Amino acid sequence: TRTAISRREYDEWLSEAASLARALRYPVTPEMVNDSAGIVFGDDQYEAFAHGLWSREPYEVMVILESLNEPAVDGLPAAGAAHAEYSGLCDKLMIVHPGKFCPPHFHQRKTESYEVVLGEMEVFYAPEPVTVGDDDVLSFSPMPEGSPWPEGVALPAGREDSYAGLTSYVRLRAGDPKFVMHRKHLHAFRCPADSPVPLVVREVSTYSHEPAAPLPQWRGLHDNTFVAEAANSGRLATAIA
Amino acid sequence: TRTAISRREYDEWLSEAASLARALRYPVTPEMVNDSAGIVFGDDQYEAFAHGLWSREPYEVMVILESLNEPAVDGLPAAGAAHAEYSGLCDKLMIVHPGKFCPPHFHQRKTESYEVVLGEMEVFYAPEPVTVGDDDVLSFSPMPEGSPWPEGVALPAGREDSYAGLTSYVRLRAGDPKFVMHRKHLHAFRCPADSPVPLVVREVSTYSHEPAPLPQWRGLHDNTFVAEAANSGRLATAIA
Amino acid sequence: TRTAISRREYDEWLSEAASLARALRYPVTPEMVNDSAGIVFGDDQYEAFAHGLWSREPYEVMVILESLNEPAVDGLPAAGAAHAEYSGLCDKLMIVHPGKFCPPHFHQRKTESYEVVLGEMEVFYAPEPVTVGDDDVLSFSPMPEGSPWPEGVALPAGREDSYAGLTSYVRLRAGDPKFVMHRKHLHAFRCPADSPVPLVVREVSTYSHEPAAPLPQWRGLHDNTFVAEAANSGRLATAIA
Amino acid sequence: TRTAISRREYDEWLSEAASLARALRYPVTPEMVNDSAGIVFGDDQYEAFAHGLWSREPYEVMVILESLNEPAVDGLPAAGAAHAEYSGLCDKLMIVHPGKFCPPHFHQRKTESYEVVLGEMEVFYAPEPVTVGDDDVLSFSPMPEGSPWPEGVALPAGREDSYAGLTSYVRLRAGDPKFVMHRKHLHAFRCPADSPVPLVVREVSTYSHEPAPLPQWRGLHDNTFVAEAANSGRLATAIA
Ligand SMILES: O=C(CO)[C@@H](O)[C@@H](O)[C@@H](O)CO
Ligand SMILES: O=C(CO)[C@@H](O)[C@@H](O)[C@@H](O)CO
Ligand SMILES: OC[C@@H]1O[C@@](O)(CO)[C@@H](O)[C@H]1O
Ligand SMILES: OC[C@@H]1O[C@@](O)(CO)[C@@H](O)[C@H]1O
Ligand SMILES: OC[C@@H]1O[C@](O)(CO)[C@@H](O)[C@H]1O
Ligand SMILES: OC[C@@H]1O[C@](O)(CO)[C@@H](O)[C@H]1O
Ligand SMILES: [Mn+2]
Ligand SMILES: [Mn+2]
Ligand SMILES: [Mn+2]
Ligand SMILES: [Mn+2]
């Protein structure tokens, strides 16, 4: 039981993640390795450091290195400023240790894609979208059926049912085609508990609203809704001692 | 003068590009390596294959391995269907050989970004955006001024006048932060002629409208090249 | 039927091989990309370029990029100068296109190891050593039994029986442990004809004698004996037109 | 003062090093990642784990992933058994964190070479070889003169006097040609303290005699460190 992470644990966690990134050729600059790159989804998830990121235990903890989050507003017809928040460009590298997760959530605006760079990624998602904001949406290439869950997945203690609605499953390996996760779709993912290396996946998505705004309606905008209330709150800052 | 590329030249060109991409961990699939991946911008540009891709001669030809081109239309409010074309997600690996260029052009809808993976990238662009229509556009962080062209840049014969307005220059190297090329801006880039390796650059941008997720998107070409030759062409590589 | 390779074919062959090398982080400097890096084992093997290195046809052609060939003579007790030629250090990167081979041969002095960097390597070898020079040799870790040949290997036209004595087989993939090929052992290897990429393997071996000598007895020393007489000769220079 | 490393510290240290190695395509196997891969040169060097491997503090500790250590005795003429110990093949990936060192030492038999894969390497060595015995040795291409030490190098406390004779300095960067360290020469190296990544260097050398291919090779230690502390130690990492 701990409510924070020591400065040594935090620096090591991010230094090694950024080294792996740099090793894998991701464009890492110093500003990217900051106090908000290492995410702990909820105070009860700081417990992940009791034994460490190589304990292979299930926790919702991860590091994100963002190299791009472009509003893509310049040159856009002023008439399109109403939906500009559904567009934009974002490129980030995510690092998840064995058995760890990126918890159940959905985005109202952000549509994302995945590219596994190192290791393997198990994605749990809801094939059917939710309805947020506008009731009249477009449709073109609905999410695929995926597969039933594989046997043997260890879910985080005290948050197992938050995964209840993510019934579809797909395992992505390095070299596999990009996997698209449309906006308003519940999803989550982990690095197999038995992986010899951390999971390194590049996320290419639309603008990432995660609190000089491009547009006035963009200020204080939150685009991440977590199923587990606990993870919803903590995602906004990391307690470093 | 060459008017097409032999099947052998084409397959070696793309096989080697796809291997280089896979060597650099870019997710290449069988379908990404097709007869349209290798682009020749204009019939007069097939002459690049007279001496080959390592002749270090100036021509406008390249390889594009597109791993992603997502409309991102699903879940988007119907209210925004009118401007969805300026959105979407595209991820591609571009391979340009020494001395070769991605010809001068601009996109009305697409905004892009570059990530140099291998070698060096010389970007030529206009810091000021063109004015297609006028319809009051938005601004936030306009294009940086850049620097003047260094000396020694050899342009393709018969196309040199098309780079006139692209007065701004930036040189991107492997490991450099992302460079953004806002829509409506004229631009072009090349692999320095003295480079020991081909330029391998990753493009992350909005949807690439090139030959139906949305009715109005049908038959949409979002690439307008300065040179009419490469403009009215580049729709299909001629392979013999 | 051709007895040489055009300058365009040669430059492209080596430029792309060196780019792959550099891509894979091998230390390539300009002096390494020279007129002797692209090897054609015998005049009858120039035919490989009739259709090209992506034709997937069986030919004994390859590129070698040598980054190190250190005599390791400095500091060595003068009393050991007699066997110094069996030692030394060599590091080279080899690139073999789909279906192509590095022909049957053995070394009197050179002991080598293999590290597959990209693609897969099929090694054909003789578990039993030959006797050259000294009759009283040492022994510690004899070559392993390997496996019988797999079905479906296409051998070069007019040289199939030169492979007759290389009865053992082992398939090496990227990430596999180093494979040691002891001196005086017949061996050869190819890149599977169906590989989507060329085979890139790093060779770490003892000094490579392949015609200011470190020692006088080293001058004009040849340490490569090919089964096929044809490949023995050609290996010394490449006919570039 | 620390006297050992916790099992957790050890496993994280090697797990991360092995992942970095695999990320860089180095052939790592389960058996390469063992309780001896992580080396601490001297009991007073366990203090490096007081603040950790990213404290950028000067200590002599590192990770060695040995993919090869071939005696190359097979097929070698019996006549040369006497000097076989100066031969053989060794391939290992060494991972040194910012500010950390591979302590001053020399090998009587081993000659090595370095290939920087990631980060930068600062090598300190004596251009002149030590004289263990005298037995007329051979020469061909002696060690280059090198340059003087740059300013700013922080040495490990209590060991600084052991780097006195290593007056020559060379800085190797990723992609640089191979650097050779002939046997009998004192040397040491570190990862610059301001480095954003750990130093990843590939060692290609003759056989590494460290804790029976040949009778006389039994119990042979070919590493002689200047500092007695790291000398009489380093035979086994103390893990709690
Ligand atoms: O925009 C790009 C490079 O700036 C390319 O994707 C595009 O120009 C290419 O498709 C050529 O038409
Ligand atoms: O020689 C090496 C680095 O110069 C290492 O292999 C060796 O020093 C190491 O085993 C430490 O004893
Ligand atoms: O690259 C240097 C400058 O660019 C030009 O190549 C533009 O054509 C030359 O005018 C030279 O002045
Ligand atoms: O690194 C710079 C030089 O090396 C030293 O650190 C050697 O201890 C200092 O003497 C300084 O003069
Ligand atoms: O808070 C976790 C968020 O979820 C992700 O979209 C993972 O799918 C990341 O990009 C973060 O923005
Ligand atoms: O001539 C091919 C020789 O054979 C090899 O040993 C391949 O086993 C290369 O290193 C070359 O020296
Ligand atoms: Mn998400
Ligand atoms: Mn463009
Ligand atoms: Mn050989
Ligand atoms: Mn040493």
PDB file of C-alpha atoms in Angstrom, chain A residues 24-29 67-68 70-81 83-84 86-91 108 111-113 115 117-118 134 136-142 175-178 180 182-184 202 204-206 212-215, chain B residues 24-29 67-68 70-81 83-84 86-91 108 111-113 115 117-118 135-142 174-178 180 182-184 202 204-206 212-214:
ATOM      1  CA  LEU A  24      13.778   1.862 -31.657  1.00  0.00           C
ATOM      2  CA  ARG A  25      14.352   5.152 -33.498  1.00  0.00           C
ATOM      3  CA  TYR A  26      11.425   7.107 -32.080  1.00  0.00           C
ATOM      4  CA  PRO A  27      12.182  10.879 -32.123  1.00  0.00           C
ATOM      5  CA  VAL A  28      12.675  11.579 -28.417  1.00  0.00           C
ATOM      6  CA  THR A  29      13.633  15.030 -27.208  1.00  0.00           C
ATOM      7  CA  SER A  67       6.247  13.395 -30.289  1.00  0.00           C
ATOM      8  CA  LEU A  68       3.315  15.023 -32.040  1.00  0.00           C
ATOM      9  CA  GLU A  70      -0.835  18.929 -34.066  1.00  0.00           C
ATOM     10  CA  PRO A  71      -4.220  20.716 -34.086  1.00  0.00           C
ATOM     11  CA  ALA A  72      -4.158  20.828 -37.899  1.00  0.00           C
ATOM     12  CA  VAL A  73      -6.268  23.993 -37.703  1.00  0.00           C
ATOM     13  CA  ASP A  74      -4.163  26.151 -40.056  1.00  0.00           C
ATOM     14  CA  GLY A  75      -5.645  26.395 -43.544  1.00  0.00           C
ATOM     15  CA  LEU A  76      -8.916  24.789 -42.428  1.00  0.00           C
ATOM     16  CA  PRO A  77     -12.066  26.620 -43.687  1.00  0.00           C
ATOM     17  CA  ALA A  78     -13.486  28.608 -40.757  1.00  0.00           C
ATOM     18  CA  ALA A  79     -16.773  26.833 -41.450  1.00  0.00           C
ATOM     19  CA  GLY A  80     -15.157  23.613 -40.225  1.00  0.00           C
ATOM     20  CA  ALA A  81     -14.037  24.970 -36.857  1.00  0.00           C
ATOM     21  CA  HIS A  83     -15.608  19.719 -35.781  1.00  0.00           C
ATOM     22  CA  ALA A  84     -11.896  20.536 -35.897  1.00  0.00           C
ATOM     23  CA  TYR A  86     -12.404  15.445 -34.125  1.00  0.00           C
ATOM     24  CA  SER A  87      -9.415  15.876 -36.410  1.00  0.00           C
ATOM     25  CA  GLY A  88      -5.793  16.872 -35.836  1.00  0.00           C
ATOM     26  CA  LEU A  89      -2.678  14.704 -35.705  1.00  0.00           C
ATOM     27  CA  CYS A  90      -1.053  12.833 -32.833  1.00  0.00           C
ATOM     28  CA  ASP A  91       1.914  10.461 -32.725  1.00  0.00           C
ATOM     29  CA  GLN A 108     -15.571  11.057 -27.931  1.00  0.00           C
ATOM     30  CA  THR A 111      -9.839   7.855 -33.456  1.00  0.00           C
ATOM     31  CA  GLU A 112      -6.611   5.859 -33.114  1.00  0.00           C
ATOM     32  CA  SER A 113      -4.421   3.274 -34.840  1.00  0.00           C
ATOM     33  CA  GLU A 115       1.558  -0.256 -34.681  1.00  0.00           C
ATOM     34  CA  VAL A 117       7.026  -2.082 -32.610  1.00  0.00           C
ATOM     35  CA  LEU A 118       8.322  -4.541 -30.014  1.00  0.00           C
ATOM     36  CA  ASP A 134     -24.233  14.469 -31.571  1.00  0.00           C
ATOM     37  CA  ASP A 136     -26.485  11.729 -35.925  1.00  0.00           C
ATOM     38  CA  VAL A 137     -23.082  10.285 -36.796  1.00  0.00           C
ATOM     39  CA  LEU A 138     -21.432   8.962 -39.942  1.00  0.00           C
ATOM     40  CA  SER A 139     -20.481   5.368 -40.676  1.00  0.00           C
ATOM     41  CA  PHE A 140     -18.193   3.663 -43.167  1.00  0.00           C
ATOM     42  CA  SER A 141     -15.997   0.871 -41.845  1.00  0.00           C
ATOM     43  CA  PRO A 142     -17.426  -0.412 -38.536  1.00  0.00           C
ATOM     44  CA  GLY A 175       4.854  -6.240 -38.327  1.00  0.00           C
ATOM     45  CA  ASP A 176       1.112  -6.730 -38.297  1.00  0.00           C
ATOM     46  CA  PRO A 177      -1.064  -4.280 -40.236  1.00  0.00           C
ATOM     47  CA  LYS A 178      -2.154  -1.108 -38.424  1.00  0.00           C
ATOM     48  CA  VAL A 180      -7.728   1.070 -36.157  1.00  0.00           C
ATOM     49  CA  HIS A 182     -12.603   4.124 -33.989  1.00  0.00           C
ATOM     50  CA  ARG A 183     -13.738   6.877 -31.650  1.00  0.00           C
ATOM     51  CA  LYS A 184     -16.525   6.131 -29.154  1.00  0.00           C
ATOM     52  CA  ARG A 202       3.270   3.525 -31.748  1.00  0.00           C
ATOM     53  CA  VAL A 204      -1.088   7.360 -34.638  1.00  0.00           C
ATOM     54  CA  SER A 205      -4.348   9.130 -33.952  1.00  0.00           C
ATOM     55  CA  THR A 206      -6.276  12.375 -34.258  1.00  0.00           C
ATOM     56  CA  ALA A 212      -3.014  28.919 -25.735  1.00  0.00           C
ATOM     57  CA  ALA A 213      -5.767  26.807 -27.335  1.00  0.00           C
ATOM     58  CA  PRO A 214      -5.995  26.344 -31.133  1.00  0.00           C
ATOM     59  CA  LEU A 215      -9.682  27.238 -30.938  1.00  0.00           C
TER      60      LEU A 215
ATOM     61  CA  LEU B  24      13.724  -0.351 -40.082  1.00  0.00           C
ATOM     62  CA  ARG B  25      10.714  -2.065 -38.485  1.00  0.00           C
ATOM     63  CA  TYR B  26       8.034  -0.434 -40.651  1.00  0.00           C
ATOM     64  CA  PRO B  27       4.936  -2.677 -40.847  1.00  0.00           C
ATOM     65  CA  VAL B  28       5.032  -3.758 -44.488  1.00  0.00           C
ATOM     66  CA  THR B  29       2.384  -6.135 -45.804  1.00  0.00           C
ATOM     67  CA  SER B  67       0.425   1.335 -44.003  1.00  0.00           C
ATOM     68  CA  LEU B  68      -2.550   3.555 -43.153  1.00  0.00           C
ATOM     69  CA  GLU B  70      -8.086   5.863 -42.427  1.00  0.00           C
ATOM     70  CA  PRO B  71     -11.001   8.202 -43.269  1.00  0.00           C
ATOM     71  CA  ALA B  72     -11.879   8.429 -39.562  1.00  0.00           C
ATOM     72  CA  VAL B  73     -15.443   9.091 -40.727  1.00  0.00           C
ATOM     73  CA  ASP B  74     -17.064   6.558 -38.350  1.00  0.00           C
ATOM     74  CA  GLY B  75     -18.585   8.155 -35.254  1.00  0.00           C
ATOM     75  CA  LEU B  76     -17.987  11.600 -36.724  1.00  0.00           C
ATOM     76  CA  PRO B  77     -21.097  13.816 -36.418  1.00  0.00           C
ATOM     77  CA  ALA B  78     -23.069  14.226 -39.660  1.00  0.00           C
ATOM     78  CA  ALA B  79     -22.793  17.970 -39.022  1.00  0.00           C
ATOM     79  CA  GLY B  80     -19.103  17.764 -39.896  1.00  0.00           C
ATOM     80  CA  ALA B  81     -19.377  15.657 -43.051  1.00  0.00           C
ATOM     81  CA  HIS B  83     -15.104  19.157 -43.743  1.00  0.00           C
ATOM     82  CA  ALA B  84     -14.231  15.532 -42.985  1.00  0.00           C
ATOM     83  CA  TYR B  86      -9.495  17.748 -44.245  1.00  0.00           C
ATOM     84  CA  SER B  87      -9.236  15.066 -41.568  1.00  0.00           C
ATOM     85  CA  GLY B  88      -8.480  11.349 -41.396  1.00  0.00           C
ATOM     86  CA  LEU B  89      -5.228   9.517 -40.690  1.00  0.00           C
ATOM     87  CA  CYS B  90      -2.445   8.497 -43.030  1.00  0.00           C
ATOM     88  CA  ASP B  91       0.845   6.719 -42.306  1.00  0.00           C
ATOM     89  CA  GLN B 108      -5.879  21.859 -50.293  1.00  0.00           C
ATOM     90  CA  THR B 111      -1.676  18.608 -43.529  1.00  0.00           C
ATOM     91  CA  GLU B 112       1.397  16.434 -43.037  1.00  0.00           C
ATOM     92  CA  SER B 113       4.423  15.856 -40.819  1.00  0.00           C
ATOM     93  CA  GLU B 115       9.929  11.960 -39.333  1.00  0.00           C
ATOM     94  CA  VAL B 117      14.139   7.508 -40.167  1.00  0.00           C
ATOM     95  CA  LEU B 118      17.263   7.074 -42.283  1.00  0.00           C
ATOM     96  CA  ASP B 135     -13.014  31.420 -47.734  1.00  0.00           C
ATOM     97  CA  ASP B 136     -11.575  32.791 -44.485  1.00  0.00           C
ATOM     98  CA  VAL B 137      -9.357  30.004 -43.159  1.00  0.00           C
ATOM     99  CA  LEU B 138      -8.095  29.438 -39.628  1.00  0.00           C
ATOM    100  CA  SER B 139      -4.628  30.141 -38.203  1.00  0.00           C
ATOM    101  CA  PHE B 140      -2.812  29.120 -35.029  1.00  0.00           C
ATOM    102  CA  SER B 141       0.846  28.417 -35.635  1.00  0.00           C
ATOM    103  CA  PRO B 142       1.873  29.300 -39.219  1.00  0.00           C
ATOM    104  CA  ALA B 174      17.375  11.185 -38.532  1.00  0.00           C
ATOM    105  CA  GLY B 175      16.159  11.539 -34.963  1.00  0.00           C
ATOM    106  CA  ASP B 176      14.966  15.120 -35.370  1.00  0.00           C
ATOM    107  CA  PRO B 177      11.611  16.186 -33.934  1.00  0.00           C
ATOM    108  CA  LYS B 178       8.578  16.049 -36.229  1.00  0.00           C
ATOM    109  CA  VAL B 180       4.839  19.958 -39.901  1.00  0.00           C
ATOM    110  CA  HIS B 182       0.384  22.685 -43.081  1.00  0.00           C
ATOM    111  CA  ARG B 183      -2.162  22.201 -45.842  1.00  0.00           C
ATOM    112  CA  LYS B 184      -2.191  24.714 -48.724  1.00  0.00           C
ATOM    113  CA  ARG B 202       7.698   8.563 -42.318  1.00  0.00           C
ATOM    114  CA  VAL B 204       1.958  11.090 -40.587  1.00  0.00           C
ATOM    115  CA  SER B 205      -0.922  13.179 -41.905  1.00  0.00           C
ATOM    116  CA  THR B 206      -4.624  13.622 -42.574  1.00  0.00           C
ATOM    117  CA  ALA B 212     -16.145   5.683 -51.044  1.00  0.00           C
ATOM    118  CA  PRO B 213     -16.069   6.521 -47.300  1.00  0.00           C
ATOM    119  CA  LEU B 214     -18.192   9.576 -48.030  1.00  0.00           C
TER     120      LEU B 214
END
